[PDB]
Design a protein around this nucleic acid. Structure first.
Ligand code: MN
Ligand code: MN
Ligand code: MN
Ligand code: MN
Ligand code: NA
Length: 344
DNA sequence: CGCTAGTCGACAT
DNA sequence: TCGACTAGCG
């Protein structure tokens, strides 16, 4: 959701081929592939007609990784995150709008236009993802459903040393503190890598290459958890953090118009939103696959009360988190759609 | 120049 | 699940 982030830090990126990670473990932001896969068969998906074309699309990529001796872990988005509800609403509204329009264009005969609308009405469901999971597993590929956003789960797997890199199209994964992200990776393995440790290569960040400041910059520029103040993008957010001296980020935001020589009113709820968004990048719940439990992405500090962090994912019993992670529990019916047992 | 909001692009015949 | 582009605005 950090619009314009990749161009802005392009200096820190390197063209690569995934051969680099041969014999290592890479995690995949699989909903990216799913959304790409679904475009080919949008019409049938919109009409409710049966399709599994998207499964073969994802499997091309999976197969390619395996051929180069990469051990992929496919990660899937799970339950809805309240911090993202506004964005979830606008996406839902847009899908609905386009689906209706396509249908009306079918009673018109304009199949060309109707196709353009359907393709923008695509909704990726757990049922669709679960078909990819079965395909993957049958080829011995580890799959994991995040309890909430795949984003934080990926970050967690990268930070824990479980995977060495993350394949995704979402550059905001860097604000979650991923070490290595591989973007724009094509079907042949060519892609664009950004390492957190090379963010200092990026001249226009100044000293906003440190984890905490980089996160603040991303949030300030406007992210999925929190719309920016009007007139603030990456460059001005970066500028505020460069020029600001005070460590207390709240006191800096309150006087943000000062650092920028702009008339910017900062509403009281914006500070609250900013804190919430910060806490969401930091403490969004993930599933530790080794101990098989729900944990915050980072350990709680001595400044956060975990009781107040519902918006970052509510805890559920670990036995339930397990069934979700294995893909057994449908997200929504919360009923068993499968009974895969990794032990046996 | 930097930011915004709208648009449109991803598939693959 | 997202990103790239662009014309217009300050
Ligand atoms: Mn849940
Ligand atoms: Mn979703
Ligand atoms: Mn994201
Ligand atoms: Mn995501
Ligand atoms: Na912004």
């Amino acid at each position: 959701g950090i619009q314009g982030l990749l161009q802005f830090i392009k200096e820190a990126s390197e063209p690569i081929h995934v051969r680099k990670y041969k014999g290592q473990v890479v995690a995949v932001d699989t909903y990216c592939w799913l959304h790409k896969g679904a475009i080919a068969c949008a019409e049938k998906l919109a009409k409710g007609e049966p399709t599994d074309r998207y499964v073969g699309f994802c499997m091309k990529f999976v197969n390619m990784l395996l051929s180069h001796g990469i051990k992929p872990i496919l990660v899937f988005d799970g339950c809805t995150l309240p911090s993202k509800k506004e964005v979830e609403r606008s996406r839902r509204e847009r899908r609905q709008a386009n689906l209706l329009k396509g249908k009306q264009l079918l009673r018109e005969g304009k199949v060309s236009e109707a196709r353009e609308c359907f393709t923008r009405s695509i909704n990726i469901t757990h049922a669709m993802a679960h078909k990819v999971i079965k395909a993957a597993r049958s080829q011995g590929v580890d799959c994991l459903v995040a309890p909430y956003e795949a984003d934080a789960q990926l970050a967690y797997l990268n930070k824990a040393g479980i995977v060495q890199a993350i394949i995704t199209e979402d550059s905001a994964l860097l604000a979650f503190g991923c070490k290595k992200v591989i973007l724009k990776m094509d079907q042949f393995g060519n892609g664009l890598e950004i390492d957190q440790a090379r963010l200092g290569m990026c001249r226009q960040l100044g000293d906003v290459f440190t984890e905490e400041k980089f996160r603040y910059m991303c949030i300030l520029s406007g992210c999925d958890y929190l719309s920016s103040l009007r007139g603030i993008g990456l460059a001005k957010a970066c500028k505020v953090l460069r020029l600001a001296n005070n460590p207390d980020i709240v006191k800096v935001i309150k006087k943000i118009g000062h650092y920028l020589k702009m008339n910017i009113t900062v509403p009281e709820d914006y500070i609250n939103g900013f804190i919430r968004a910060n806490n969401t990048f930091l403490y969004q719940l993930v599933f530790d696959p080794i101990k098989r439990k729900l944990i915050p992405l980072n350990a709680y500090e001595d400044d956060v009360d975990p009781e107040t962090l519902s918006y970052a994912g509510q805890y559920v019993d670990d036995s339930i988190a397990l069934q979700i992670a294995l893909g057994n529990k449908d997200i929504n019916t919360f009923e068993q759609i499968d009974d895969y047992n990794p032990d046996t």
